[PDB]
Design an enzyme around this catalytic site. Structure first.
Site, PDB file in Angstrom:
ATOM      1  CB  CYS B 435      -0.940   0.015   1.205  1.00  0.00           C
ATOM      2  SG  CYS B 435      -2.258  -1.218   1.155  1.00  0.00           S
ATOM      3  CD  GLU B 437       2.957  -1.415   3.247  1.00  0.00           C
ATOM      4  OE1 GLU B 437       2.074  -0.923   2.512  1.00  0.00           O
ATOM      5  OE2 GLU B 437       3.079  -2.655   3.378  1.00  0.00           O
TER       6      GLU B 437
END
Lengths: 796, 796
Positions: B435, B437
């Protein structure tokens, strides 16, 4: 500051001994069933937690028995001298021997049909789960090749547990398992949820708690049974004894020992359950006269204990040490013949402060041996320049009975050897012996003191055969032997052959080490060894302060003399060509075409007339020193996965006989398939210059670099020890070797005709004990080949 | 570079339509094969067993070439199907056999035959799963905190880890053949006697086996292609099949020699990684960088057209949507929309700090537009030297409502990575995992989605003094009505946070040990430094960088809640602490006597009228900053068993809805069981000052200290992006936020009526994509409650 006078023997002791031997040793299946039952129920959990849970289930449900007139209780099998089985390490070997184990030549065991069925059923769960299988998978192909051609065997920790440890007995005596648990809960307080090692550390510590409570539950089952047997006992005195046993077992090992009998019973319980948790042997009581002494002294001074009873208690413990047993596969059993568990118990030596440590118990342990007169324990005495002359004379007297005990150990070499490997002076001074001859700082070490048997002759043979064995390639190719142009080329060829195969042995042992770390961490043994609790890991994983691996080299005498032959007959005097020596070896010197047979006998005979190792001949002995270095120096450079170092040992157990069976004829004159030398001493029959000269040769080896221990066997005729003057000259002999940095000595004192008669009429020598190597055994429970080896050893 | 969009092949829609003709289906083939293999490798070390199972699966897994495919490689026969992964867990699945076809989040078809096959295969894995072991390693307090929904570590508990960008460019440059060579070379550094030889060699042998399996796998496809090509009557397709056949014979075994080879090589690695383990967020990363040299050479040699290059890329895009994964129903609601979170990023900087934009950068954006499916999770790196043309092209894609790309700020991310240990050179090469990171690709085991932590649940525990349902759920920080300053309340909140954060670290560390012991991964590991050199898997600490990255939820809710308490209870004294507490208990009377109800409603109304986070109001925002720190600061102090650090992340996936469902009413005005905030952005409908004010509030948090990544969602109306004037204000908005050191933005561009029409007539909107949080999804594949959360979000 002690009473050296022997204490009288109780009539009980002989009845206890006789009962141990009334029937054949028997294999039982209860342990296998219980460990399987438990593991089935704990699948999914961490290994060390499953091991603790299984220890718990075993100790809660294992059949227990109090044998007639036992003062000290704790039996592992219903049958005296029986064994349980240990499928978590290996079991296929046992299933294979179901029909033969009762009548096999070394260490037969009885096994009932019903036990066979029960074992088959319980074992099936362990297929693919054993340490032996994982160890196998971790070995290089070259390592398995080397083991197939018998260069070395790591069978010991391959088939069964490790052991080879002196646990903190004194800690259990002083604070009890209650105190140990408290030490654990205290360490748990230093652990926080988010610590990176919380999961594994806490699970290990919880496992100790479960394990400790298991042993406490176990002792309490004996208290209950003792109470029950007491109510059914007609003999008033015996009734009282059972009531005492009942109270004692409610106290120890949970709580600190408060009397001598409690310390005796607490000790035994520890000694016993370690060998239920694991089948590792050489669980060695160590400095028993030291840590038992405060409990003896308190009790004797407050009037509540007599010397006679105290002696009876120790005598009973001596007997119990022979009640335990272990069944090894038939091949392994030849290397560990005589049903020994190699439980070494040592007396005397120095305090941490460096004064003589002799006390009343030191003497009473020697007497226990004489009274019980069984193979175990392996009684030992520590010798140093300030040794009590009384204790030495007392030991000498025991040795003179022919029991083979005690073995004598040299503080003056062992303490610096230990220090050089990392022990502090205070720690080294407190050493004891593990198993046969392996020194250790007790309660702080995972020593792996008998990790493998390495045959030093097999690489020598490989020099001749350029790495071929049995038609197949078996080792590295150091070159065609007939093209070597000097002795130094041949030596180098040998060194290399040695190095390559030593490295493979290290591979075998390291593979097995990972297997135990992964599949067999031992919460109970670990909690009694620094620094497992604090580090939060088992002794199998690196928890102990000191970590070693100790593999044994075989055949120093054989190799030394062989190299002398080669040096002096082939290269210097050139009385023999390399080629014809090789064919002579091939044909076993013509002993099993008549030009050539006689030509081979002639070669054989000029080899036997060469000077031999063990006669204080410098030029032969220097090759022994240097050949020993070809094994001991490379070894000390390797590491193990527990974070520690290898260290060479040089002792045979009874494996010099099967190892010799795997070795063809050697240039020293030894015939094919015949035993190789035992320990570091001279080949039987080659030392013809008396014991002093023998000691002088052997003392020329570097013993300290072999910090896993050396073994020197010697056999006296009984008249050599006669009278007080005999005992004193005996001590001088030992002191002479020890002054020359010799490490260890042990003696058979026996007439040759006694042993020959014991062979011809075994039924008449039921009780006859002999020294094998680093342990004693009943002569008639040894196979003929091992008997013959003991019989042919040089008599001084 | 050339920025003009390349045209779309008519093949693409036929490929997309085939993916979606039928329901996603669960298949049993992998379970059977992994069971078959593990049953046959018992007694071998775990990493070897994993290698052998991977080998057995890739040799025997049914394969298929889908109609008209140019890039081949399917994991299931059914498109968008999944295999199962019993080695992590399976009991949740068996429990859902009857309901998974019609469940509300991510349903799957499962045939009756498949149920039977799974039941038979699964039975072996009872007691052998990572989930069972992890459980046994968690503290009782950790299990309690999980029972009360303070956090959930379900992700790596039920299934694999993943969350990695491997060295694709290494497979492309030297092939798996070169990787094997790299391994064999390292093997020559290993000597038989090394303490780590057994484990290192076993690990390296396992890589060899794993690499050969993948080569075997590609070759099965080459053979099938040849067979199909024999019976294919369309001459042009027949040619495509022959070309596929030739391609799969060269890659990934050998270095890619063309763009199609590079594409096929990439895809095979992307695919088999997710056969080896079920971990998702297997993130392609800087695809436009490492794919570029193969494109460039192929283009300039004339061999390849821009049209065909684009078509290949579009095919990969389609393929990325062919893989799927079934999660348990509860977990499915947190990862809704069948996503695998396969993140692929374009643009940014070279390691030398110049703009990295190239032809492929534009073609990846075009591929999203062409295919118009949820995956890949297209991202773009923004920095001050970003190509304005690329940013505009990204802006265009976002305008379509697809929710792509996500925009990432190099200016914050690169220094954040450096501060956590990356070199400047490495950090400059970062891409995004899953997502939001950030990671240094090919060197990290980041555990970037290790848990979801609910920051509201500790806030609830301050009011209830650690109680939940009458039982103790946490520590007692004190009666909430006795705090007499706001600082005492804050301190109570901080301690509730600290206690429960530490438990989360316990949960994750327990799970970490379970994967390291039961599921090391030889193939994934060999494409990550420094596993080969160190001789250990990335699950064990072989990777250069090791992290654990847990996600904090509800920053906006907590900030506003604390503001409410500060102003209304302590400063303006408009409410008693006790009456606020009652109001929360009774959910503001929104679901009593009527006087009470509208009292609570009156309280609710004034809380709603308070200024809120997301309006550039300093006194509210400093509480958001400080609250975030109660999470992000203690987490950076913890370690994981791989020798790395924890680092906080702040993103929701789709879990803000089920977590919100587990949370009572909060002082911010949020009603009970309603979703918590998505990411670090303002509560829906609370930001009423425009997008620039919103950004200003959110940039007041410390984003750098949350080095696992933050998420900021925003929704535009389509007319806000209309015209080139719209695209540039859009870019300016992002730049404005990034200049204040925000880390990330992503956008929905959609009219409310469209989403509502999609709910009323989903048959009309099967193609409609929305942005969820760090990923996009087909709107009509989302449950009603998640659709409603997306609908209720603020429109600018």
């Amino acid at each position: 500051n002690y009473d050296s006078t022997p204490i009288a023997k109780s009539d009980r002791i002989k009845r206890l001994v006789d009962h141990l031997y009334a029937k054949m040793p028997e294999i039982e299946a209860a342990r296998a069933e219980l460990i399987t039952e438990s593991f089935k129920a704990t699948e999914g959990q961490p290994v060390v937690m499953r091991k603790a849970r299984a220890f718990e289930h075993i100790l809660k449900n294992l059949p227990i028995i109090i044998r007639p007139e036992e003062l000290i209780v704790g039996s592992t099998t219903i049958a005296p001298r029986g064994c349980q089985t240990y499928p978590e390490f290996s079991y296929e070997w046992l299933e294979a021997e179901f029909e033969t184990v009762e009548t096999r030549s070394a260490d037969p065991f009885y096994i009932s049909e019903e036990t066979k069925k029960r074992l088959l059923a319980a074992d099936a769960y362990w297929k693919g789960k054993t340490t032996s299988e994982l160890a196998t998978s971790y070995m290089a192909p070259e390592t398995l090749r080397a083991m197939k051609h018998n260069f070395f065997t790591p069978g010991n920790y391959f088939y069964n547990g490790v052991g080879h440890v002196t646990v903190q007995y004194e800690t259990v005596l002083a604070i009890g398992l209650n105190g140990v648990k408290e030490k654990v809960r205290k360490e748990m307080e230093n652990c926080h949820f988010g610590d990176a090692d919380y999961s594994t550390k806490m699970c290990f510590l919880e496992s100790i708690l479960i394990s400790c409570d298991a042993v406490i539950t176990y002792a309490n089952r004996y208290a209950k049974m003792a109470e029950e047997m007491a109510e059914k006992e007609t003999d008033a005195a015996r009734r009282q004894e059972l009531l005492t046993i009942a109270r004692v077992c409610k106290n120890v090992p949970e709580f600190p020992a408060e009397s001598f009998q409690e310390a005796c019973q607490s000790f035994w319980f520890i000694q016993q359950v370690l060998q239920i948790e694991s089948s590792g042997h050489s669980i060695s009581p160590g400095r028993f006269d030291q840590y038992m002494y405060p409990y003896y002294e308190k009790d004797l001074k407050e009037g509540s204990l007599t010397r006679e009873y105290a002696q009876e208690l120790i005598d009973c413990i001596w007997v119990k040490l022979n009640d335990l047993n272990k069944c090894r596969d038939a091949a392994s059993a030849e290397g560990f013949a005589g049903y020994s568990l190699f439980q070494n118990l040592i007396v005397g030596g120095q305090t941490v402060q460096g004064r003589d440590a002799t006390n009343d118990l030191s003497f009473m342990c020697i007497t226990a041996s004489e009274h019980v007169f069984l193979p175990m324990p392996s009684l030992s005495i520590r010798v140093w320049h300030g040794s009590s002359k009384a204790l030495l004379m007392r030991a000498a007297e025991l040795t003179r009975t022919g029991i083979g005990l005690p073995a004598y150990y040299n503080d003056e070499v062992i303490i610096p050897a230990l220090v050089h490997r990392g022990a502090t002076m205070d720690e080294a001074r407190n050493y004891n012996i593990i198993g046969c001859v392996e020194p250790q700082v007790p309660g702080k070490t995972d020593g792996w003191h008998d990790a493998a048997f390495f045959n030093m002759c097999r690489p020598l043979e490989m020099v001749f055969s350029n790495g071929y064995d049995n038609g197949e390639i078996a080792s590295i190719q150091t070159g065609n032997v007939e093209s070597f142009q000097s002795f130094d080329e041949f030596m180098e060829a040998y060194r290399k052959q040695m190095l390559y195969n030593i490295e493979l042995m290290v591979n075998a042992d390291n593979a097995i080490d990972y297997a135990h770390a992964k599949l067999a961490p031992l919460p109970f043994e670990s909690c009694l060894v620094d620094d497992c609790i604090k580090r939060g890991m088992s002794a199998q994983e690196g928890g102990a302060i000191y970590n070693f691996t100790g593999p044994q080299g075989f055949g120093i005498a054989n190799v030394a003399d062989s190299l002398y032959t080669i040096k002096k007959l082939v290269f210097e005097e050139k009385r023999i060509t390399m080629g014809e020596l090789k064919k002579a070896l091939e044909m076993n010197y013509g002993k099993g075409p008549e030009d050539v047979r006689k030509r081979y006998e002639e070669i054989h005979e000029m080899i036997l007339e060469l000077p031999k190792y063990g006669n204080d001949i410098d030029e032969v002995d220097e090759l022994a020193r240097e050949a020993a270095y070809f094994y001991t120096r490379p070894l000390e450079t390797f590491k193990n996965p527990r974070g520690g170092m290898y260290q060479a040992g040089l002792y045979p157990v009874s494996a010099n006989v099967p190892l010799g069976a795997q070795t063809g004829a050697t240039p020293d004159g030894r015939l094919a398939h015949t035993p190789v030398a035992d320990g570091v001493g001279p080949t039987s029959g080659f030392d013809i210059s008396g014991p002093t000269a023998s000691c002088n040769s052997v003392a020329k080896l570097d013993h300290a670099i072999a910090s896993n221990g050396t073994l020197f066997n010697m056999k006296m005729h009984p008249t050599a020890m006669a009278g007080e003057k005999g005992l004193e000259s005996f001590i001088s002999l030992i002191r002479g070797y020890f002054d020359q940095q010799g490490m260890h000595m042990q003696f058979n004192v026996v007439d040759r005709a006694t042993l020959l008669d014991a062979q011809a009429h075994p039924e008449k020598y039921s009780g006859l004990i002999v020294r094998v190597a680093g342990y004693s055994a009943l002569f008639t429970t040894l196979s003929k080949s091992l008997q013959d080896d003991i019989i042919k050893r040089t008599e001084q």
